[PDB]
């Protein structure tokens, strides 16, 4: 059966988890030089000093790391991937990986989208945050959402990851409460992310992103097909990859559709390229495929 290259969503991490990998690995070093030129700054140095978990600098560095690990894994393990897919942030990585964007343009886009989101969320949708959690069966989830409904609290399911694994976007006045409620029913809160992602309510952000960051870029046809993360559709053109990146703002990630599409495409093995402890480990993926988890730790 076929091998697919997969790019994870971006979780929070410390510079400390990857710094040594970044400056020592041959593949990261080449992409960093290209990144620094594009950006006009030393990414490693800015990332080291950065605030929070999702700075512009941490996002570009995650880009660098995932694409580096994909190349490293192909070469060192003689993978000849036939198809690829990215989840959430990983759409940006797969855009680079598939050559739908030059690596420089992918860095430009990633930086631009980071700044665009930062500016948007500093004057719009104030207080919105995205929560990731596991061991939350959907019926238990639905109970929590029905309690939010009773109090008129806005929310959207931003990611469907597994049967019991989701990301929920809502107002931060409900964050601590949600964490408690999840723990009440045996679920496990993982992390709270800002900027938030994937929500019908983010149409004005999609527009701004389109105008300021994405419209100016030249997309190229991918060198291999790309399975969209909104719905599992197989994509073969630059335009489709562009559309995917913009749809990402307003449609949820549906990882089960990505996995079942890949099964339908005759995939039996996947490599998950990047610092990840979610996408390479979740049952949705492992129940379907043999997984290679190409992490900084494996590469070292
Ligand atoms: Ca209320």
mmCIF file of C-alpha atoms and ligand atoms in Angstrom:
data_model
loop_
_atom_site.group_PDB
_atom_site.id
_atom_site.type_symbol
_atom_site.label_atom_id
_atom_site.label_comp_id
_atom_site.label_asym_id
_atom_site.label_seq_id
_atom_site.Cartn_x
_atom_site.Cartn_y
_atom_site.Cartn_z
ATOM 1 C CA UNK A 1 0.000 0.000 0.000
ATOM 2 C CA UNK A 2 0.935 3.659 -0.326
ATOM 3 C CA UNK A 3 2.794 5.957 2.027
ATOM 4 C CA UNK A 4 1.384 9.391 2.900
ATOM 5 C CA UNK A 5 3.262 12.329 4.356
ATOM 6 C CA UNK A 6 1.280 14.063 7.121
ATOM 7 C CA UNK A 7 1.795 17.421 8.820
ATOM 8 C CA UNK A 8 0.423 18.002 12.326
ATOM 9 C CA UNK A 9 -1.415 20.926 13.893
ATOM 10 C CA UNK A 10 0.670 23.205 16.030
ATOM 11 C CA UNK A 11 0.616 22.624 19.764
ATOM 12 C CA UNK A 12 2.224 24.807 22.264
ATOM 13 C CA UNK A 13 5.896 23.995 23.004
ATOM 14 C CA UNK A 14 8.975 25.629 24.433
ATOM 15 C CA UNK A 15 11.881 26.721 22.355
ATOM 16 C CA UNK A 16 13.613 24.317 24.757
ATOM 17 C CA UNK A 17 11.990 21.232 23.159
ATOM 18 C CA UNK A 18 13.485 21.969 19.686
ATOM 19 C CA UNK A 19 16.293 24.556 19.849
ATOM 20 C CA UNK A 20 19.136 22.045 19.670
ATOM 21 C CA UNK A 21 17.451 20.143 16.866
ATOM 22 C CA UNK A 22 16.996 23.369 14.907
ATOM 23 C CA UNK A 23 20.591 24.591 14.910
ATOM 24 C CA UNK A 24 22.222 21.168 14.647
ATOM 25 C CA UNK A 25 20.103 19.296 12.019
ATOM 26 C CA UNK A 26 21.231 19.683 8.428
ATOM 27 C CA UNK A 27 17.716 19.987 7.032
ATOM 28 C CA UNK A 28 16.560 22.650 9.488
ATOM 29 C CA UNK A 29 19.750 24.675 8.974
ATOM 30 C CA UNK A 30 19.123 25.039 5.228
ATOM 31 C CA UNK A 31 15.483 26.056 5.700
ATOM 32 C CA UNK A 32 16.449 28.501 8.475
ATOM 33 C CA UNK A 33 18.840 30.399 6.182
ATOM 34 C CA UNK A 34 16.050 30.740 3.679
ATOM 35 C CA UNK A 35 13.628 31.747 6.426
ATOM 36 C CA UNK A 36 16.009 34.424 7.885
ATOM 37 C CA UNK A 37 16.489 36.017 4.458
ATOM 38 C CA UNK A 38 12.869 36.182 3.824
ATOM 39 C CA UNK A 39 12.036 37.622 7.216
ATOM 40 C CA UNK A 40 14.961 39.991 7.758
ATOM 41 C CA UNK A 41 15.657 38.574 11.168
ATOM 42 C CA UNK A 42 17.268 35.624 12.933
ATOM 43 C CA UNK A 43 14.303 33.330 13.517
ATOM 44 C CA UNK A 44 16.100 31.134 16.064
ATOM 45 C CA UNK A 45 17.013 34.158 18.149
ATOM 46 C CA UNK A 46 13.567 35.712 18.003
ATOM 47 C CA UNK A 47 11.935 32.314 18.804
ATOM 48 C CA UNK A 48 14.202 31.835 21.832
ATOM 49 C CA UNK A 49 13.136 35.141 23.306
ATOM 50 C CA UNK A 50 9.507 35.063 22.196
ATOM 51 C CA UNK A 51 6.507 35.484 24.488
ATOM 52 C CA UNK A 52 3.646 32.989 24.700
ATOM 53 C CA UNK A 53 3.199 29.734 22.786
ATOM 54 C CA UNK A 54 2.053 30.918 19.394
ATOM 55 C CA UNK A 55 4.188 33.926 18.514
ATOM 56 C CA UNK A 56 4.899 34.683 14.875
ATOM 57 C CA UNK A 57 8.352 33.317 15.602
ATOM 58 C CA UNK A 58 7.096 30.033 17.065
ATOM 59 C CA UNK A 59 4.791 29.510 14.054
ATOM 60 C CA UNK A 60 7.538 29.991 11.462
ATOM 61 C CA UNK A 61 9.808 27.769 13.482
ATOM 62 C CA UNK A 62 7.159 25.031 13.524
ATOM 63 C CA UNK A 63 6.971 25.353 9.698
ATOM 64 C CA UNK A 64 10.673 25.000 9.452
ATOM 65 C CA UNK A 65 10.715 21.974 11.771
ATOM 66 C CA UNK A 66 7.895 20.036 10.113
ATOM 67 C CA UNK A 67 9.120 20.473 6.551
ATOM 68 C CA UNK A 68 12.696 19.676 7.669
ATOM 69 C CA UNK A 69 11.566 16.439 9.361
ATOM 70 C CA UNK A 70 9.556 15.451 6.288
ATOM 71 C CA UNK A 71 12.667 15.753 4.073
ATOM 72 C CA UNK A 72 14.836 14.066 6.678
ATOM 73 C CA UNK A 73 12.416 11.199 7.046
ATOM 74 C CA UNK A 74 12.078 10.647 3.226
ATOM 75 C CA UNK A 75 15.775 10.619 2.637
ATOM 76 C CA UNK A 76 16.920 8.715 5.690
ATOM 77 C CA UNK A 77 14.100 6.133 5.542
ATOM 78 C CA UNK A 78 13.574 5.833 1.743
ATOM 79 C CA UNK A 79 9.998 6.894 1.826
ATOM 80 C CA UNK A 80 8.525 7.774 -1.488
ATOM 81 C CA UNK A 81 5.276 9.350 -0.348
ATOM 82 C CA UNK A 82 2.466 9.276 -2.891
ATOM 83 C CA UNK A 83 0.079 11.701 -1.228
ATOM 84 C CA UNK A 84 0.029 14.179 1.622
ATOM 85 C CA UNK A 85 -2.133 16.037 4.039
ATOM 86 C CA UNK A 86 -1.915 18.724 6.681
ATOM 87 C CA UNK A 87 -3.996 19.409 9.748
ATOM 88 C CA UNK A 88 -4.801 22.987 10.677
ATOM 89 C CA UNK A 89 -1.361 24.746 10.798
ATOM 90 C CA UNK A 90 -0.117 21.688 8.807
ATOM 91 C CA UNK A 91 -1.878 23.048 5.729
ATOM 92 C CA UNK A 92 0.887 25.678 5.684
ATOM 93 C CA UNK A 93 3.557 23.016 6.012
ATOM 94 C CA UNK A 94 1.980 20.846 3.275
ATOM 95 C CA UNK A 95 1.801 23.947 0.988
ATOM 96 C CA UNK A 96 5.581 24.175 1.311
ATOM 97 C CA UNK A 97 6.182 20.496 1.193
ATOM 98 C CA UNK A 98 4.161 19.924 -1.981
ATOM 99 C CA UNK A 99 5.731 22.971 -3.696
ATOM 100 C CA UNK A 100 2.371 24.739 -3.961
ATOM 101 C CA UNK A 101 4.398 27.592 -2.563
ATOM 102 C CA UNK A 102 8.068 28.252 -2.683
ATOM 103 C CA UNK A 103 9.549 27.855 0.729
ATOM 104 C CA UNK A 104 10.150 31.599 0.876
ATOM 105 C CA UNK A 105 6.551 32.387 -0.040
ATOM 106 C CA UNK A 106 5.364 29.840 2.535
ATOM 107 C CA UNK A 107 7.417 31.640 5.179
ATOM 108 C CA UNK A 108 5.998 34.964 3.963
ATOM 109 C CA UNK A 109 2.476 33.624 4.180
ATOM 110 C CA UNK A 110 2.981 32.100 7.606
ATOM 111 C CA UNK A 111 4.436 35.388 8.982
ATOM 112 C CA UNK A 112 1.739 37.444 7.305
ATOM 113 C CA UNK A 113 -1.079 35.226 8.619
ATOM 114 C CA UNK A 114 0.412 35.369 12.127
ATOM 115 C CA UNK A 115 0.487 39.168 12.014
ATOM 116 C CA UNK A 116 -2.930 39.328 10.355
ATOM 117 C CA UNK A 117 -4.452 37.140 13.098
ATOM 118 C CA UNK A 118 -2.645 39.123 15.836
ATOM 119 C CA UNK A 119 -4.028 42.419 14.554
ATOM 120 C CA UNK A 120 -7.548 40.990 13.956
ATOM 121 C CA UNK A 121 -7.850 39.409 17.406
ATOM 122 C CA UNK A 122 -6.505 42.558 19.144
ATOM 123 C CA UNK A 123 -9.507 44.645 17.873
ATOM 124 C CA UNK A 124 -12.097 41.912 16.901
ATOM 125 C CA UNK A 125 -13.504 38.876 18.663
ATOM 126 C CA UNK A 126 -11.977 39.987 21.820
ATOM 127 C CA UNK A 127 -11.543 37.190 24.398
ATOM 128 C CA UNK A 128 -11.993 34.226 22.097
ATOM 129 C CA UNK A 129 -9.845 31.147 22.799
ATOM 130 C CA UNK A 130 -9.590 27.634 21.408
ATOM 131 C CA UNK A 131 -9.468 24.596 23.792
ATOM 132 C CA UNK A 132 -8.100 21.228 22.983
ATOM 133 C CA UNK A 133 -9.160 18.144 25.045
ATOM 134 C CA UNK A 134 -9.334 14.324 24.916
ATOM 135 C CA UNK A 135 -11.290 11.561 26.688
ATOM 136 C CA UNK A 136 -14.439 13.600 26.053
ATOM 137 C CA UNK A 137 -17.015 11.390 24.363
ATOM 138 C CA UNK A 138 -19.241 13.402 22.051
ATOM 139 C CA UNK A 139 -22.312 12.845 24.207
ATOM 140 C CA UNK A 140 -20.429 14.243 27.157
ATOM 141 C CA UNK A 141 -19.287 17.105 24.977
ATOM 142 C CA UNK A 142 -22.848 17.729 23.876
ATOM 143 C CA UNK A 143 -23.937 17.974 27.461
ATOM 144 C CA UNK A 144 -21.418 20.709 28.130
ATOM 145 C CA UNK A 145 -22.434 22.599 24.979
ATOM 146 C CA UNK A 146 -26.072 22.342 25.985
ATOM 147 C CA UNK A 147 -25.149 23.970 29.355
ATOM 148 C CA UNK A 148 -23.329 26.771 27.396
ATOM 149 C CA UNK A 149 -26.484 27.061 25.238
ATOM 150 C CA UNK A 150 -28.652 27.571 28.374
ATOM 151 C CA UNK A 151 -26.489 30.524 29.396
ATOM 152 C CA UNK A 152 -26.371 32.018 25.864
ATOM 153 C CA UNK A 153 -22.609 31.410 25.558
ATOM 154 C CA UNK A 154 -21.257 31.358 21.933
ATOM 155 C CA UNK A 155 -19.133 28.399 20.891
ATOM 156 C CA UNK A 156 -18.042 26.428 17.833
ATOM 157 C CA UNK A 157 -16.459 23.025 17.470
ATOM 158 C CA UNK A 158 -13.247 23.913 15.718
ATOM 159 C CA UNK A 159 -11.693 20.511 15.377
ATOM 160 C CA UNK A 160 -12.997 17.008 15.212
ATOM 161 C CA UNK A 161 -10.011 14.815 15.951
ATOM 162 C CA UNK A 162 -11.378 11.434 17.247
ATOM 163 C CA UNK A 163 -14.544 10.043 18.777
ATOM 164 C CA UNK A 164 -13.503 11.602 22.096
ATOM 165 C CA UNK A 165 -11.057 14.257 21.015
ATOM 166 C CA UNK A 166 -12.011 17.783 19.991
ATOM 167 C CA UNK A 167 -11.111 21.447 19.935
ATOM 168 C CA UNK A 168 -13.811 23.939 21.046
ATOM 169 C CA UNK A 169 -13.712 27.667 20.442
ATOM 170 C CA UNK A 170 -15.500 30.047 22.811
ATOM 171 C CA UNK A 171 -15.161 33.165 25.073
ATOM 172 C CA UNK A 172 -12.436 33.056 27.710
ATOM 173 C CA UNK A 173 -14.948 33.881 30.490
ATOM 174 C CA UNK A 174 -15.891 30.136 30.149
ATOM 175 C CA UNK A 175 -12.349 28.659 29.931
ATOM 176 C CA UNK A 176 -11.746 27.728 33.557
ATOM 177 C CA UNK A 177 -15.270 26.467 33.819
ATOM 178 C CA UNK A 178 -14.951 24.304 30.691
ATOM 179 C CA UNK A 179 -11.715 22.766 32.010
ATOM 180 C CA UNK A 180 -13.486 21.877 35.272
ATOM 181 C CA UNK A 181 -16.506 20.484 33.548
ATOM 182 C CA UNK A 182 -14.343 18.305 31.295
ATOM 183 C CA UNK A 183 -12.420 16.965 34.282
ATOM 184 C CA UNK A 184 -15.897 16.258 35.939
ATOM 185 C CA UNK A 185 -16.721 13.668 33.336
ATOM 186 C CA UNK A 186 -13.280 12.019 33.066
ATOM 187 C CA UNK A 187 -11.987 14.107 30.115
ATOM 188 C CA UNK A 188 -8.632 15.696 29.970
ATOM 189 C CA UNK A 189 -8.054 19.390 29.026
ATOM 190 C CA UNK A 190 -4.866 19.651 26.989
ATOM 191 C CA UNK A 191 -4.315 23.297 26.191
ATOM 192 C CA UNK A 192 -5.957 26.665 25.464
ATOM 193 C CA UNK A 193 -4.737 28.404 22.322
ATOM 194 C CA UNK A 194 -4.581 32.033 21.219
ATOM 195 C CA UNK A 195 -5.103 33.071 18.491
ATOM 196 C CA UNK A 196 -8.159 30.929 18.134
ATOM 197 C CA UNK A 197 -8.882 28.957 14.922
ATOM 198 C CA UNK A 198 -11.587 27.545 12.578
ATOM 199 C CA UNK A 199 -14.920 29.260 13.107
ATOM 200 C CA UNK A 200 -17.764 30.334 10.853
ATOM 201 C CA UNK A 201 -17.635 33.555 12.794
ATOM 202 C CA UNK A 202 -14.192 34.379 11.357
ATOM 203 C CA UNK A 203 -15.384 35.493 7.910
ATOM 204 C CA UNK A 204 -13.940 39.000 8.302
ATOM 205 C CA UNK A 205 -10.582 37.489 9.235
ATOM 206 C CA UNK A 206 -10.665 35.257 6.142
ATOM 207 C CA UNK A 207 -11.380 38.369 4.022
ATOM 208 C CA UNK A 208 -8.594 40.336 5.583
ATOM 209 C CA UNK A 209 -6.178 37.438 5.210
ATOM 210 C CA UNK A 210 -7.199 37.039 1.581
ATOM 211 C CA UNK A 211 -6.624 40.770 0.851
ATOM 212 C CA UNK A 212 -3.492 41.327 2.840
ATOM 213 C CA UNK A 213 -1.561 38.057 2.746
ATOM 214 C CA UNK A 214 -2.895 35.352 0.368
ATOM 215 C CA UNK A 215 -4.147 37.232 -2.770
ATOM 216 C CA UNK A 216 -0.605 38.561 -3.496
ATOM 217 C CA UNK A 217 0.985 35.138 -3.592
ATOM 218 C CA UNK A 218 1.617 32.909 -6.539
ATOM 219 C CA UNK A 219 0.538 29.344 -5.975
ATOM 220 C CA UNK A 220 1.881 26.397 -8.011
ATOM 221 C CA UNK A 221 0.422 22.960 -8.577
ATOM 222 C CA UNK A 222 1.547 20.520 -5.886
ATOM 223 C CA UNK A 223 4.058 17.886 -6.969
ATOM 224 C CA UNK A 224 1.873 15.250 -5.309
ATOM 225 C CA UNK A 225 -1.729 15.209 -4.348
ATOM 226 C CA UNK A 226 -2.958 16.897 -1.118
ATOM 227 C CA UNK A 227 -5.868 15.569 0.936
ATOM 228 C CA UNK A 228 -7.871 18.626 2.237
ATOM 229 C CA UNK A 229 -8.421 18.711 6.029
ATOM 230 C CA UNK A 230 -11.832 20.264 5.831
ATOM 231 C CA UNK A 231 -13.372 17.189 4.174
ATOM 232 C CA UNK A 232 -10.852 14.670 2.733
ATOM 233 C CA UNK A 233 -11.055 15.942 -0.853
ATOM 234 C CA UNK A 234 -8.079 15.176 -3.042
ATOM 235 C CA UNK A 235 -6.459 18.361 -4.390
ATOM 236 C CA UNK A 236 -4.082 18.720 -7.392
ATOM 237 C CA UNK A 237 -3.867 22.481 -8.183
ATOM 238 C CA UNK A 238 -2.372 25.662 -6.645
ATOM 239 C CA UNK A 239 -5.774 27.247 -6.549
ATOM 240 C CA UNK A 240 -7.220 24.388 -4.475
ATOM 241 C CA UNK A 241 -4.372 24.729 -1.949
ATOM 242 C CA UNK A 242 -5.005 28.507 -1.761
ATOM 243 C CA UNK A 243 -8.701 27.814 -1.171
ATOM 244 C CA UNK A 244 -7.939 25.318 1.511
ATOM 245 C CA UNK A 245 -5.787 27.841 3.441
ATOM 246 C CA UNK A 246 -8.584 30.389 3.354
ATOM 247 C CA UNK A 247 -11.329 27.862 4.199
ATOM 248 C CA UNK A 248 -9.331 26.873 7.186
ATOM 249 C CA UNK A 249 -10.366 30.114 8.946
ATOM 250 C CA UNK A 250 -14.076 29.333 8.666
ATOM 251 C CA UNK A 251 -14.492 25.548 8.596
ATOM 252 C CA UNK A 252 -13.547 23.004 11.188
ATOM 253 C CA UNK A 253 -10.634 20.550 10.913
ATOM 254 C CA UNK A 254 -12.147 17.061 10.359
ATOM 255 C CA UNK A 255 -9.322 14.624 10.883
ATOM 256 C CA UNK A 256 -11.502 11.472 10.556
ATOM 257 C CA UNK A 257 -12.366 12.536 6.978
ATOM 258 C CA UNK A 258 -8.666 12.958 6.235
ATOM 259 C CA UNK A 259 -7.899 9.489 7.598
ATOM 260 C CA UNK A 260 -10.836 7.745 5.891
ATOM 261 C CA UNK A 261 -9.999 9.495 2.555
ATOM 262 C CA UNK A 262 -6.436 8.239 2.823
ATOM 263 C CA UNK A 263 -7.674 4.736 3.551
ATOM 264 C CA UNK A 264 -9.853 5.092 0.427
ATOM 265 C CA UNK A 265 -6.776 6.212 -1.561
ATOM 266 C CA UNK A 266 -5.078 2.908 -0.529
ATOM 267 C CA UNK A 267 -2.697 4.302 2.109
ATOM 268 C CA UNK A 268 -1.301 1.773 4.623
ATOM 269 C CA UNK A 269 1.590 3.782 6.158
ATOM 270 C CA UNK A 270 1.953 7.439 7.188
ATOM 271 C CA UNK A 271 4.788 9.584 8.360
ATOM 272 C CA UNK A 272 3.823 12.364 10.704
ATOM 273 C CA UNK A 273 6.549 14.985 10.239
ATOM 274 C CA UNK A 274 7.176 17.350 13.080
ATOM 275 C CA UNK A 275 7.187 18.070 16.764
ATOM 276 C CA UNK A 276 3.936 16.364 17.522
ATOM 277 C CA UNK A 277 2.430 14.267 20.331
ATOM 278 C CA UNK A 278 -1.182 14.425 19.076
ATOM 279 C CA UNK A 279 -1.613 13.484 15.368
ATOM 280 C CA UNK A 280 0.886 10.666 15.306
ATOM 281 C CA UNK A 281 -0.556 9.135 18.447
ATOM 282 C CA UNK A 282 -4.327 9.544 18.253
ATOM 283 C CA UNK A 283 -6.422 6.428 17.642
ATOM 284 C CA UNK A 284 -7.979 7.922 14.526
ATOM 285 C CA UNK A 285 -4.552 7.654 12.895
ATOM 286 C CA UNK A 286 -3.082 4.544 14.633
ATOM 287 C CA UNK A 287 -6.115 2.327 14.173
ATOM 288 C CA UNK A 288 -5.883 2.960 10.412
ATOM 289 C CA UNK A 289 -2.194 2.977 9.576
ATOM 290 C CA UNK A 290 1.302 1.989 10.438
ATOM 291 C CA UNK A 291 2.721 5.308 11.799
ATOM 292 C CA UNK A 292 6.192 6.698 11.517
ATOM 293 C CA UNK A 293 6.496 9.623 13.984
ATOM 294 C CA UNK A 294 9.293 11.804 12.595
ATOM 295 C CA UNK A 295 9.982 13.995 15.638
ATOM 296 C CA UNK A 296 13.088 16.053 16.668
ATOM 297 C CA UNK A 297 13.850 13.231 19.159
ATOM 298 C CA UNK A 298 13.861 10.536 16.500
ATOM 299 C CA UNK A 299 15.980 12.730 14.255
ATOM 300 C CA UNK A 300 18.586 13.171 17.016
HETATM 301 CA CA1 LIG B 1 -24.392 34.491 29.180
#
